[PDB]
Design a protein around this motif. Structure first.
Motif, PDB file in Angstrom:
ATOM      1  N   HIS A  91      -0.266   1.659  -3.901  1.00  0.00           N
ATOM      2  CA  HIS A  91       1.293   1.114  -4.624  1.00  0.00           C
ATOM      3  C   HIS A  91       1.360  -0.016  -3.587  1.00  0.00           C
ATOM      4  N   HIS A  93       5.131  -2.512  -1.862  1.00  0.00           N
ATOM      5  CA  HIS A  93       6.281  -2.657  -1.466  1.00  0.00           C
ATOM      6  C   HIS A  93       6.476  -4.376  -1.465  1.00  0.00           C
ATOM      7  N   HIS A 116      -0.234  -0.262   0.301  1.00  0.00           N
ATOM      8  CA  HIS A 116      -0.428   1.128   0.733  1.00  0.00           C
ATOM      9  C   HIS A 116      -1.648   1.874  -0.078  1.00  0.00           C
ATOM     10  N   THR A 195       7.260   6.258   4.043  1.00  0.00           N
ATOM     11  CA  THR A 195       8.486   5.261   4.253  1.00  0.00           C
ATOM     12  C   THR A 195       9.599   5.452   2.945  1.00  0.00           C
TER      13      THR A 195
HETATM   14 ZN   LIG Z   1       4.432   2.804   0.680  1.00  0.00          ZN
END
Ligand SMILES: [Zn+2]
Ligand SMILES: [Zn+2]
Ligand SMILES: [Zn+2]
Ligand SMILES: [Zn+2]
Ligand SMILES: [Zn+2]
Ligand SMILES: [Zn+2]
Ligand SMILES: [Zn+2]
Ligand SMILES: [Zn+2]
Ligand SMILES: [Zn+2]
Length: 257
Positions: A91, A93, A116, A195
């Motif tokens: 995924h 961010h 990530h 996170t």
């Molecule tokens: Zn992440």
């Protein structure tokens, strides 16, 4: 429900998730002047040739590409890791502007996005038991900068319109994650957390030195996604990054000089 908005964002997560102010939170700023080389760090071994992608989904916080992790198909080994960690999903961010979006920062530089690739330690038998342990997971973090299109990302970009809103998913087979790596595998590493809530302190972070380049048209496609489900008010999926947290009593080790 926690989120990345005005009243449910990173600064408020401590209310429902007190571990938000714990001793090993992620992300962090990587000061390249104090993250000293460490000659005992083995080189990192990434094996993604047999990766089997299953589906892609918008979970209201980001979008995940999930993988078959029933066997050692796609695994990460070496570097700071003991044993074998299987790829379960990746995924990203990303920001509302090119000047922000990454979670980790390098000498306070923010990147436009961060990938990530999430992996769990086969020593524990399944993801669910792995996240309960200090050494449960390894996340490989890759910075994204705007420039030339990344061909390997295109299949992702092309399917995003089909999962615009929370809860939506699509079949997503035969995606090759090697097309998302930079050429070099030099890295920093430290022990930290997820996170996002629930922020468990279960992750060995491995962040790559070299970022990948993606096109502004590719990143614009990320910014067209929604945090909300179909038929709720539109909230664009942007700025879904948590800022740097205090490093506290931790060392960040570099694999290169
Ligand atoms: Zn992440
Ligand atoms: Zn809202
Ligand atoms: Zn408070
Ligand atoms: Zn410094
Ligand atoms: Zn200095
Ligand atoms: Zn949620
Ligand atoms: Zn599975
Ligand atoms: Zn299907
Ligand atoms: Zn619809």
């Amino acid at each position: 429900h926690w989120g990345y908005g005005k009243h449910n964002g990173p600064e408020h997560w401590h209310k429902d998730f007190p571990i938000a102010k714990g001793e090993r939170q992620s992300p962090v700023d990587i000061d390249t002047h104090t993250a000293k080389y460490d000659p005992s760090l083995k080189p990192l071994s990434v094996s993604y040739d047999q990766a089997t992608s299953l589906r892609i989904l918008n979970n209201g916080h980001a979008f995940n590409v999930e993988f078959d992790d029933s066997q050692d198909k796609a695994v990460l080994k070496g570097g700071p890791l003991d044993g074998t960690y299987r790829l379960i999903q990746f995924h990203f961010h990303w920001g509302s502007l090119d000047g922000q979006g990454s979670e980790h920062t390098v000498d306070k530089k923010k990147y436009a996005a961060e990938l990530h690739l999430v992996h769990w330690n086969t020593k524990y038998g399944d993801f669910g038991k792995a996240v309960q342990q200090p050494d449960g997971l390894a996340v490989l973090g890759i910075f994204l900068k705007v420039g030339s299109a990344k061909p390997g990302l295109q299949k992702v970009v092309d399917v995003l319109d089909s999962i615009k809103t929370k809860g939506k998913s699509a079949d997503f087979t035969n995606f090759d994650p090697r097309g998302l790596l930079p050429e070099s595998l030099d890295y920093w590493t430290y022990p930290g957390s997820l996170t996002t809530p629930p922020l468990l302190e279960c992750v060995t972070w491995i962040v790559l030195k070299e970022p990948i380049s993606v096109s502004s048209e590719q990143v614009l496609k990320f910014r067209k996604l929604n945090f909300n489900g179909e038929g709720e008010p539109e909230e664009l999926m942007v700025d879904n990054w948590r800022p740097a947290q205090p490093l506290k009593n931790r060392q960040i080790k570099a694999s290169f000089k």
